[PDB]
RNA sequence: GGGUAGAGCACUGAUUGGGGGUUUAGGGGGCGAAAGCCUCCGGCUCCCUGUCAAACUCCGAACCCACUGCCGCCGUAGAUGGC
RNA sequence: GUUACUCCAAAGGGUGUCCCUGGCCUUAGACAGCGG
RNA sequence: GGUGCCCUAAGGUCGGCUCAGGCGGGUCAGGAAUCCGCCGUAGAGUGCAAGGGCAAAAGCCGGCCUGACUGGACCCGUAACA
RNA sequence: GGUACGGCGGCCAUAGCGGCGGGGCCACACCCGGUCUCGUUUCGACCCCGGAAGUUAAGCCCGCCAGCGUUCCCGGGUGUACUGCCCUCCGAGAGGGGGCGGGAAACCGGGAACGCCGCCGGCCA
């Protein structure tokens, strides 16, 4: 039986947490700041459902190109295409 | 017994117990769905406004319309508790027993008796003063075993208050 | 029933979970400990699998009956603590085909149960004293006969060390 | 703490001193914070700015600094803090309340009113302020007949002369 | 960034037996002058002991993916790319 | 037997022969035999 | 293994509170539920399947409301890469 | 430069749970009572309000304990189990083996560990 892709298909592990986190993250993540051109890792936090990208791109590294609202604009290169996302800083982590 | 409570009072009096509160329930229950005046019975004999207590899962005896008056209880504090006990303790048996007291030193009575119908359930719960931190909002915490209450401290407090014991 | 060479090997995924398998059967084996259970014997004679294997509960029960009757007729209930260590958890299935639809919708219905064993794994044990090692070895042989693959027996002492050669030399 | 699956809460939450949800909502703003705590016998207040290694305090005020725990003392605390802040070079702020519930007519909001009157911009709607007959003392004085307003106004004029 | 192989029982579910207890919701009962205080086969509670998992995990590889820098190779005798 | 694979029969047995190891008896041992 | 719905609240926000079960007391045919205290990392509950999330809560108890609105942009998925 | 004092935080169990002994200028608490703001679908029990008769028994602070639990180090288990690439290697088959590279988990023994850091105050001389 062929099954279409959806937001939460095969996410049992990818969007779980070690039972010792089990709650709100420390607040230095919600209050991050990045600059245009900075490289960021995409690391989804499963307790915040706002500003969350397709989990297919969990584990990738992109670059910041701008800002809209409280969300940052992140560009990735999927194969030979550029894709643009508006992601909340709680799902991001800087490279070095 | 006396050993313990008197030695601990010699230490300091903040270890001395008291009556946290006196709760008078009508547990066996008789209301059903009517305003049977047990409300007024307890009201007149206590001295303030009563409260009901709604029901739970479907059953047989009473409490089958989940939400309906099924009982009446009142929680007295202050002097009023000492007062009501100064006649209820007299009413029912002297030499307060040992199976009245549970693992922690609070005890209960199961007395039962135009409307004069009532089967009551009394219970005194005791404590020392500094137990309000486990119920406070700020900096809440639990009580150690040192400042916690035992059984024979209850027995001696009860004898001295107004009774003998078995 | 169907030959055991169909179920011998272990090349299929594990199929041991009953909250999802519809119509699974109960076991035909209920006794795994026989004899004297609180008697602190000296020698422990244990069977060992030579390669990975899948044993049917039928074979297990036959082994049990034969070995226990032998040990009773020869040694005596007061001795010989006899134990089977493995339980049947695998579920075996057969395709309901043989009018028929052949290989259309082939997914077997459950028929039986089996225990999985890996290489150099213990299957059963006889705890006995010196004067009955002959009969313990006899039981080893009888059980060896009724198995799909081959197996080897070893002997152990208190502290569980191998004294098999020393005990085999001196009879 | 009972095994490998037991989550141990934050230290301040174990202690019973910080609400992190409200902390987040307040930090979402980049304006600074006006903290006001209250004890059985005293008040304290200060002005705080955020840093990821630890909050930094710029100003403070204590009822000891005053008398060198009620609505008049809180109003004078607000007076002091509002007069002190306008020096340091900050004219903006938002209130923080912690684990104190908001009740219409409390000394926390008395501090808010004092600081406002001192002239520090703090957004608010005048429906929670306590009554001025409570700020005065009429409450305690008229209790005493079954810190007179005189000395209240004395301290008032003192503080206002000092920070004119 | 990940949860496969392996391993293991810390959760969900299964699975042998021997001990120490509450003794019980409960059928046979027995000194039951009749739910009864005493046992009695049974459940539940800790210590051993022997076993499991495609739809379990307190653990956890080899390996794969994205990004930065360097080596190597391609490229002004024209790269990426675009029509 | 003279078969890399494509494209070769087992459980169970053998004082058949060639080897390794570990115990027990020996200068009167392990069979047969004069003699219970 | 489930869906072809339901809901003026089961929608928005503010405040306050903490669950299942077990044990010890008191009712009692088990006690189905009402009263008391203690232990208790969630062993509960969530409008409905499964998985994931959630505790001064996203759960329970209450108050006030209709952002279940109008005019418009950009981006992701169904349908990786294409 | 002191104090066995306090507010706000960051790393979020090496910090927890449990226990043992010590302390009270200021302070933090327990505590008395409810007219008044606020409030108890009964109860000033919990929150709110006015104080301080009183106490260091609880909370808080100083120090200690490896008892439960968590984290880290060394040694063994052991280069064991598993694994990437090549093979006219073995074996009836199932499945194993060799060379070059990677490499656990349980369990066992011995060690550390009963929090670290930043800002601002008050009392004091």
Swiss-Prot record, chain A:
Organism classification: Archaea, Methanobacteriati, Methanobacteriota, Thermococci, Thermococcales
The keyword Kinase appears for this protein: no
Coiled coil region boundaries: none
One Gene Ontology molecular-function label: structural constituent of ribosome
Keywords for the protein's UniProt record, in alphabetical order: Ribonucleoprotein, Ribosomal protein
Organism of provenance: Thermococcus kodakarensis (strain ATCC BAA-918 / JCM 12380 / KOD1) (Pyrococcus kodakaraensis (strain KOD1))
InterPro entries associated with the record: Ribosomal_eL21 (IPR001147), Ribosomal_eL21_arc (IPR022856), Ribosomal_eL21_CS (IPR018259), Ribosomal_eL21_sf (IPR036948), Translation_prot_SH3-like_sf (IPR008991)
Family of this protein: Belongs to the eukaryotic ribosomal protein eL21 family.
A Pfam family hit: Ribosomal_L21e
GO cellular component term, pick one: cytosolic large ribosomal subunit
NCBIfam families: PRK04306.1
Name of the encoding gene: rpl21e
Compositional bias ranges of the Basic residues kind: 1-23
HAMAP family given in the database record: Ribosomal_eL21
Keyword Ribosomal protein attached: yes
Any one of the GO BP annotations: translation
Ranges annotated as spanning the membrane: none
Region (Disordered): 1-26
Quaternary structure note: Part of the 50S ribosomal subunit.
Protein name, entry field: Large ribosomal subunit protein eL21
Gene3D superfamilies in the record: Ribosomal protein L21
UniProtKB/Swiss-Prot annotation, chain B:
SUPFAM superfamilies membership: RL5-like
Regions annotated as coiled coil: none
Origin: domain of life: Archaea
Classification via Pfam families: Ribosomal_L5, Ribosomal_L5_C
Keywords annotated in UniProt: Ribonucleoprotein, Ribosomal protein, RNA-binding, rRNA-binding, tRNA-binding
Single GO biological process annotation from the record: translation
Gene Ontology annotations for the cellular component aspect, listed alphabetically: cytosolic large ribosomal subunit
Designated name of the protein: Large ribosomal subunit protein uL5
Swiss-Prot record, chain C:
One Gene Ontology term, aspect cellular component: cytosolic large ribosomal subunit
Gene name tied to this protein: rpl10e
Protein name: Large ribosomal subunit protein uL16
Pfam families associated with the record: Ribosomal_L16 (PF00252)
The keyword tRNA-binding is assigned to this record: no
Subunit text: Part of the 50S ribosomal subunit.
Domain of life, source organism: Archaea
Taxonomic classification: Archaea, Methanobacteriati, Methanobacteriota, Thermococci, Thermococcales
Family indicated by similarity: Belongs to the universal ribosomal protein uL16 family.
One BP annotation, GO: translation
PANTHER family xref list: 60S RIBOSOMAL PROTEIN L10
UniProtKB/Swiss-Prot annotation, chain D:
Any one GO molecular function term: 5S rRNA binding
Biological processes per GO annotation: ribosomal large subunit assembly; translation
InterPro entries per the UniProt record, alphabetical: Rbsml_uL18_euk
Superkingdom of source: Archaea
Pfam family, any one: Ribosomal_L5e
Alphabetical UniProt keywords: Ribonucleoprotein, Ribosomal protein, RNA-binding, rRNA-binding
GO CC terms of this entry: cytosolic large ribosomal subunit
HAMAP family: Ribosomal_uL18_A
Family membership noted in the UniProt record: Belongs to the universal ribosomal protein uL18 family.
Quaternary structure note: Part of the 50S ribosomal subunit. Contacts the 5S and 23S rRNAs.
Function: This is one of the proteins that bind and probably mediate the attachment of the 5S RNA into the large ribosomal subunit, where it forms part of the central protuberance.
Name the record gives this protein: Large ribosomal subunit protein uL18
Organism listed in the record: Thermococcus kodakarensis (strain ATCC BAA-918 / JCM 12380 / KOD1)
Taxonomic path: Archaea, Methanobacteriati, Methanobacteriota, Thermococci, Thermococcales
Chain's gene name: rpl18
């Amino acid at each position: 039986v062929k099954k279409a892709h959806s937001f939460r298909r095969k996410t049992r592990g990818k969007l779980s947490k070690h039972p010792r986190r089990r709650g709100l993250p420390p607040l230095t993540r919600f209050l991050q700041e990045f600059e245009v051109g900075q490289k960021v890792h995409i690391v989804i936090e499963p307790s915040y459902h706002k500003g969350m990208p397709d989990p297919r791109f969990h584990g990738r590294t992109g670059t910041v190109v701008g800002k809209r609202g409280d969300a940052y604009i992140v560009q990735i290169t999927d194969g030979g295409k550029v894709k643009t996302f508006f992601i909340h800083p709680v799902h991001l982590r800087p490279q070095k | 017994n006396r050993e313990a409570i008197l030695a601990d009072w010699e230490a300091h009096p903040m270890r001395k117990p008291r009556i946290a509160k006196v709760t008078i329930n009508i547990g066996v229950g008789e209301s059903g769905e009517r305003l049977t005046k047990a409300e007024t019975m307890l009201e007149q004999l206590v001295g303030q406004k009563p409260i009901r207590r709604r029901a739970k899962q479907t059953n047989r005896d009473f409490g089958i319309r989940r939400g309906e008056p099924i009982a009446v209880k009142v929680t007295l504090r202050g002097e009023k508790a000492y007062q009501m006990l100064d006649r209820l303790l007299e009413a029912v048996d002297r030499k307060l027993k040992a199976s009245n007291f549970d693992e922690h030193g609070n005890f209960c009575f199961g007395i039962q008796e135009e409307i004069g119908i009532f089967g009551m359930d009394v219970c005194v719960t005791l404590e020392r003063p500094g137990f309000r931190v486990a119920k406070r909002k700020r900096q809440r915490r639990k009580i150690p075993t040192k400042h916690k209450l035992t059984k024979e401290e209850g027995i001696v407090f009860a004898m001295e208050e107004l009774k003998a014991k078995v | 029933l169907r030959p055991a060479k169909i179920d011998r090997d272990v090349d299929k995924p594990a199929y041991t979970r009953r909250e999802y398998i519809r119509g699974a059967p109960g076991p035909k084996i209920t006794i795994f400990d026989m004899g004297n259970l609180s008697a602190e014997f000296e020698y422990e004679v244990s069977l060992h699998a030579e390669q990975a294997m899948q044993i049917r509960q039928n074979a297990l029960e036959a082994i049990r009956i034969q070995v226990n009757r032998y040990l009773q007729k020869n040694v005596g209930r007061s001795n010989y603590h006899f134990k089977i260590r493995v339980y049947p958890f695998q579920v075996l299935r057969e395709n309901p085909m043989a009018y028929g639809n052949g290989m259309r919708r082939p997914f077997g219905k459950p028929i039986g149960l089996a225990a999985r064993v890996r290489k150099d794994q213990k299957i059963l044990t006889v705890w006995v004293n010196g004067q009955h090692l002959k009969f313990a070895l006899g039981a080893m042989h009888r059980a060896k006969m009724k198995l799909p693959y081959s197996a080897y027996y070893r002997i152990y002492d208190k502290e569980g060390n191998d004294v098999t050669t020393k005990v085999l030399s001196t009879m | 703490a009972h095994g490998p699956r037991y989550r141990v809460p934050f230290r301040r939450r174990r202690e019973g001193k910080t609400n992190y949800h409200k902390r987040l909502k307040l930090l979402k703003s980049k304006k600074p914070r006006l903290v006001v705590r209250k004890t059985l016998n005293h008040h304290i207040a200060q002005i705080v700015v955020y840093d990821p290694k630890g909050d930094k305090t710029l100003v403070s005020a204590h009822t000891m600094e005053l008398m060198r725990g009620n609505t008049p003392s809180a109003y004078l605390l607000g007076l002091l803090i509002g007069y002190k802040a306008k020096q340091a070079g900050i004219e903006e702020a938002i209130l923080d309340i912690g684990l104190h519930p908001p009740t219409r007519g409390s000394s926390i909001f008395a501090v808010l009113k004092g600081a406002v009157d001192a002239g520090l911009n703090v957004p608010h709607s005048e429906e929670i302020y306590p009554e001025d007959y409570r700020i005065n003392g009429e409450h305690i004085a008229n209790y005493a007949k079954a810190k007179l307003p005189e000395h209240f106004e004395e301290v008032k004029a003192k503080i206002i002369e000092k920070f004119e």
